[PDB]
Amino acid sequence: KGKLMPNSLKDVQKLICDEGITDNVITTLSRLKPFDLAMLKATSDNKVKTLLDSDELKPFWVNKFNKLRLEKDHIFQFRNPDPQSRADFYCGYVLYLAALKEKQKEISSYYDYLNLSFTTFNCFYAAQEILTFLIGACKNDTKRENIDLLYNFVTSQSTQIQEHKTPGCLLLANAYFYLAGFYLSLDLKAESIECYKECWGQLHLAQLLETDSEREIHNAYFNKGLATSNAFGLNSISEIKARCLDLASEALPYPARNVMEANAVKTFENRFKD
């Protein structure tokens, strides 16, 4: 730690309040390791965060964003992340990748980096990873305590995760579908019905958003399509809906589907106007 006794982040932070976005600051920033760059934007005072969000630094962030490549498929390229800045996309994605390095080795840093990648930067992949972990813990130990923590997360982070348009809604619907099954396995029928309903509303919102979500869909699943967004491995939202209703059965009679569908429409015209 000749990097936190000589606190590297604090020296860069000082340099930014001193000079603001200079060519010297940009050169310093470009030399940070990716992890350190993302850690800097996550943990700085609001004056430094403003300057990192400044219009002067956007070219720097675009270049970082456009150099991102996958390990396997080296032709893949991330597309403009819609209302999320490329800077926030980049930093969230870097911390998410760092979390995964720390999963086997040293699971401690895994939870911290994943929480930064989601809480601070609303990285879709961190959301997905967090929900997969919570869902999986309920599959191994389906006690009401775990179900209620899964349920609490989904209900708390719903609005923020829907910022990812169709893939966000399909992430939420998938968590609700598992929730409805968990609640049913413990005979909590009312909660099961309620999760099936939220699931249908999210599937409808996803359907409504699909034509405006292509860049999200490309980024969220790395150009592999919607197959891994759902437990049936289907590419069509109308088909997911069909097979959800098959198993939900009497939990989702038509008037109840119709009410969630109309709520989904409300949200669409009220929040995703354009």
| C-alpha dihedral (221, 223, 228, 234), degrees to nearest 10 | 140
Q: Indicate whether 145 and 56 sit together in one domain.
A: no
Token couple for 161? 């995760």
- Measured between alpha carbons, how far is 167 from 229 in angstroms, rounded to an integer? 7
Residue 16: which domain range?
Answer: 1-67+85-121
Q: Indicate whether 18 and 149 sit together in one domain.
A: no
Collect contacts of 153-157 with beta carbons under 8 A, ≥24 apart: 154/179, 157/118, 157/127
Q: Indicate whether 115 and 171 sit together in one domain.
A: no
Number of domains in the chain: 2
- Measured between alpha carbons, how far is 154 from 172 in angstroms, rounded to an integer? 7
Method by which this entry was solved:
X-ray
Domain assignment of residue 268, yes or no: yes
- Measured between alpha carbons, how far is 245 from 188 in angstroms, rounded to an integer? 19
Quoted resolution (Å): 2.2
- Measured between alpha carbons, how far is 122 from 117 in angstroms, rounded to an integer? 6
Q: SS in 3 state form for the chain?
A: CCCCCCCHHHHHHHHHHHHCCCHHHHHHHHHCCHHHHHHHHHCCCHHHHHHHHCHHHHHHHHHHHHHCCCCCCCCCCCCCCCCCCHHHHHHHHHHHHHHHHCCCCCHHHHHHHHHHHHHCCCCHHHHHHHHHHHHHHHHHCCCHHHHHHHHHHHHHHHHHHHHHHHHHHHHHHHHHHHHHHHHHHCCCHHHHHHHHHHHHHHHHHHHHHHHHCHHHHHHHCCCCCHHHHCCCCCCCHHHHHHHHHHHHHHHCCHHHHHHHHHHHHHHHHHHCCC
| C-alpha dihedral (128, 130, 132, 136), degrees to nearest 10 | -170
Contact 200, 62 (CB under 8 A): no
> For 238, what's the count of Cα atoms within 13 Å in the CB-facing half-sphere?
0
Token couple for 218? 């490309």
List Cβ neighbours of 132 (8 Å cut-off, separation of 6 or more). Answer: none
Q: Indicate whether 17 and 40 sit together in one domain.
A: yes
